[PDB]
């Protein structure tokens with residue numbers, strides 16, 4: 265693959281944010297990431313697909329588009345009764361596997377075997393009040409991340425299951441790889457770029473207020489399509505809903521944007537954190553969920569920044585003016601401390617929905 | 624790549640039509656066509672991109688998605704003055720080249736250097752009243768075909784320049800390769816599938832059933848703008864003018880090879896057979912909306928090609944008139960026009976033609992090709 269070379273970037277403490285780079289040529293002042301080395305990295309990357317009540321036909325297209333090389337991790341939070349959509353998804357995955365021999369793990373977010381595993385290792389931020397896994401995208405992602413960690417993945421890439429364009433999914437995974445192949449830190453994040461303009465406006469404002477120089481470096485504030493090395497992923501606290509993506513940025517800037525407590529994450533401060541932003545060649549066509557979603561998305565997004573400890577009054581004032589105070593985003597602790605072998609054994613010993621195919 | 628295996632098909636004389644097959648898995652009762660094999664074949668296939676006044680960003684996306692290995696042939700019939708859109712396209716292509724070094728050839732359909740070469744070799748089917756190359760997509764493809772032959776391509780694949788999905792284009796090229804890798808004959812065609820299409824197919828299938836007595840639905844790629852052929856097949860096909868080209872390829876193949884007749888003339892074609900693959904892409908087809916008239920015209924030309932076929936019957940012709948008139952695009956007592964058909968280019972001595980083009984074309988630009 266050919267891409268614009270990573271030239272311009274902005275540094276905030278230990279955080280390097282690379283300017284957005286366009287994919288120049290798909291199949292191969294320009295960076296040349298040979299097809300050969302991309303495929304080589306693919307085998308070390310788990311593609312996590314969090315889904316919830318999506319049309320099977322879209323799900324089918326997405327799964328078929330993921331490079332065979334990549335282990336697929338599906339976390340469903342689909343409706344369980346009247347009708348059991350989880351069952352329909354299971355039938356779909358079984359058929360898909362019978363025709364492709366894809367390496368796949370799937371599990372339902374509400375499996376009581378999952379709740380049991382988290383309680384026993386003493387990680388309870390993911391549990392709701394009835395002691396079951398809380399409903400939500402961030403929760404499903406966390407579950408997916410632990411499963412990816414349990415199979416030894418070095419990189420994890422997330423892709424939404426409601427994409428109308430299978431080929432874009434195929435490109436996303438390759439672009440994540442390209443991004444990882446262009447970085448020099450083991451702590452790397454790759455975010456894809458095609459309200460989000462509102463979100464980016466404020467994220468940049470979050471840093472501007474301190475530097476005194478207006479910036480537009482961040483253009484992936486709401487990027488659902490992103491990937492990270494497992495080393496970075498395991499140390500990040502995670503929020504949920506529409507706050508996940510922007511919270512990753514806010515948290516990284518908050519914690520590593522200055523040299524405070526370097527002692528606690530000495531290796532991260534040493535290597536630094538790299539954030540690549542890649543503009544895909546394919547446009548973005550997904551399901552239209554109605555606007556009580558769009559409104560939600562912006563409320564949660566700006567709330568994440570509004571509550572950041574980096575937010576000055578000016579910033580807070582403006583966010584309010586632009587939008588009662590915004591609810592504080594629910595944040596869950598990093599999963600690093602979790603003894604993975606132990607967690608995994610409890611999961612596979614008590615989960616009634618966990619399905620594995622060559623993995 | 625994984626596709627459903629080519630299990631079912633229907634044979635008409637020396638013509639084999641494979642039942643449509645779906646792509647099952649992108650990168651790798653199921654046929655496994657490994658990536659490495661597809662990549663080896665791409666070097667031998669030229670991708671022809673006929674374009675006329677399309678948006679530059681769309682054109683850009685299409686060229687960036689064609690596998691680097693494939694030589695690219697562009698034939699533009701874009702506006703020449705007020706403003707010179709061909710120049711905007713040349714700037715675009717020059718920039719694309721400096722960033723990727725893709726092998727490319729581009730020329731403008733109306734280049735007087737082209738008309739000179741056709742005229743000089745005695746091929747006038749393509750020239751209009753004043754001896755200039757006729758406007759029309761079929762005519763642009765014919766030009767692209769000779770260029771592809773001139774540079775030694777074994778296969779040719781067509782791709783429309785107004786695709787909103789670069790990825791779909793990347794898939795099309797690989798699907799063509801898949802089809803050729805699954806074929807056995809040197810005379811092979813690969814057509815991609817994803818109301819006009821449905822209507823055209825309804826009648827092409829009818830064209831056949833009027834003779835077999837059994838209703839079929841085997842043909843599902845009647846209006847397949849995205850298709851490929853081995854050069855060996857491409858060079859023996861007459862090509863219809865303007866937008867009537869794709870359905871006519873099916874019609875002519877049925878009329879001429881649908882029965883064992885006058886075999887000596889196409890000796891080897893009858894020996895090897897003609898194979899047509901139909902592959903349903905994983906990607907959706909999303910291209911530019913050109914409006915109602917355009918859609919009516921595609922309809923009119925598609926059915927006209929079938930209405931005038933030698934295989935057509937009275938029942939079929941009447942069913943077509945009712946449909947066209949009833950659909951309001953054919954006057955109440957008017958029949959479909961008979962699209963002009965240009966002859967096969969096999970007899971054109973390509974060296975001779977290519978020399979004339981090279982020595983007289985003002986729009987011809989080559990990049991490592």
Ligand SMILES: Nc1nc2c(ncn2[C@@H]2O[C@H](COP(=O)(O)OP(=O)(O)O)[C@@H](O)[C@H]2O)c(=O)[nH]1
Nearest residue numbers: 314315316339340341399400401404424425426
């Ligand atoms: N596992 C899991 N997945 C979810 C949940 N909610 C949404 N998803 C999926 O995560 C992705 C979210 O994208 P979408 O809901 O379309 O949000 P948008 O595209 O930002 O408006 C889709 O694949 C959803 O099906 C959830 O509660 N649990």
Ligand SMILES: Nc1nc2c(ncn2[C@@H]2O[C@H](COP(=O)(O)OP(=O)(O)O)[C@@H](O)[C@H]2O)c(=O)[nH]1
Nearest residue numbers: 673674675698699700758759760763783784785
């Ligand atoms: N070279 C050439 N290309 C053409 C001509 N007319 C159309 N094209 C191109 O061939 C493809 C035709 O697509 P379109 O006209 O949109 O037909 P559709 O896909 O059936 O709606 C596009 O790339 C057009 O830009 C022509 O006269 N000459």
Ligand SMILES: [Co+2]
Nearest residue numbers: 424426550551
């Ligand atoms: Co969505």
Ligand SMILES: [Co+2]
Nearest residue numbers: 783785910911
């Ligand atoms: Co079109």
